[PDB]
Design a protein around this nucleic acid. Sequence first.
DNA 1: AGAGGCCGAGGCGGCCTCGGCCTC
DNA 2: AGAGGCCGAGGCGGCCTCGGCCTC
Lengths: 120, 115, 120, 115
Amino acid sequence: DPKDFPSELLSFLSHAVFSNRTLACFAIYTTKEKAALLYKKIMEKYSVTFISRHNSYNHNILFFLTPHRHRVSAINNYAQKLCTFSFLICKGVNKEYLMYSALTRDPFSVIEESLPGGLK
Amino acid sequence: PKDFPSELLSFLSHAVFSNRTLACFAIYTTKEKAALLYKKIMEKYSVTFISRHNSYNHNILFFLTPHRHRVSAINNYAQKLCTFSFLICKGVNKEYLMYSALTRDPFSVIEESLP
Amino acid sequence: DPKDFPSELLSFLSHAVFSNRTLACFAIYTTKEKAALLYKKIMEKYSVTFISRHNSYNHNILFFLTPHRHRVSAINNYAQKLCTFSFLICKGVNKEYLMYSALTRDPFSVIEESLPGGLK
Amino acid sequence: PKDFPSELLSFLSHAVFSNRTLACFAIYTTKEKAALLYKKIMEKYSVTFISRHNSYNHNILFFLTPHRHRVSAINNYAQKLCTFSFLICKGVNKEYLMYSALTRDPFSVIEESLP
DNA sequence: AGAGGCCGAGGCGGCCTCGGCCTC
DNA sequence: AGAGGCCGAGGCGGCCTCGGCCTC
């Protein structure tokens, strides 16, 4: 199981671990099964402005924007409760557009997203 | 099983909404978990006395602690060493009366911390 | 300068130092000068339901109830900013009635309070 | 005084709203504070070079740091070692030009980290 | 150059439950 | 006895600024 996001996405993500800064864009790397579940659970839990689910090297990535700010640790705590026994990596996203755009182009692809035609 | 053997129930605290702490407890669980918990409870709660008993193809642990505890705390500890197996944890109001009953049929002593 | 409240009041006070519990009753031990100032500043800052100022062995004690809960550390942080260079001890009060009543009887006395006739 | 000597002002950054960092600074303060800060700044910021100068009955410190800093950070450090005395901290845009001017009259070198 | 968007470390100040204490 | 008020430790999850980074 992956220990981090794909190398090609790392420059868009926050790697902060000692910060209480809150933000409004997040990504989760997990199994197809757990990402499908979390897609709807995260959408509802955080009233997301946008969420998309993507293929990533036989796993899935969720990408989402929230209407209010959250600590990465909070999003992680939520997601980890619903993913006992499967891998899950949750990070804040700094370069939001670059991350989403990377996620729509090979080797990744969109599985589903909450707004028709995605973001621009 | 969803409760203790029906003939032990009057020895036990039947509290639901109490924050009362006590220093005698009983656990009803599987043979595997009772063997494991006998040792774990002894160390965790520095028990003054612990006994393990046979009870209708399951086991009962009976124990006295040197300090008082909530039933819910003992249960919280025991339950996270039992995430799959069955387990009922109850406080014991009638202490000697519970141990004595657990020493006579249908119950039998498997082991005790004091001979 | 005192290092704690008078011994006779200690059983009414919280001595917690490792807790983030919030409460709604506090006391401050400080100089006459700083207690007079804080009486009005605390009243306003926290919208107190009640505040009283008391003589205590040639210093003053402030006693107050707040309409919302606060960490002792928060009340302390506020009070300490306005008492650079003079002693100030700030504690939560557990036994609110017993504390206030003790504070109205010798060797303590009321200097001023925010409601006529005090509390009962 | 409320600013640097009026003839040094074109050597200095005149930023107010910038988060730009730099690696040359100047401090205008009292003789007592300049003697103290010369040593404190040297150690705190591991300065590559620091000079202390006379300026109209006060002193100027001039320093280069190995890493970049906000003027406000340098000021925050210097100000809390000066809670009573006057102190103006500014970044220096024209580095050699500032040091050279501070070596010629009306200014005089009291001391430099390099001869 | 100066204005200013960004972001990791980390202080601050609420919320909450656990697991004891107590009295009625 | 059981119900339940109380309270210290301490996890949680926002807010904020400092003091760097960057580009326009």
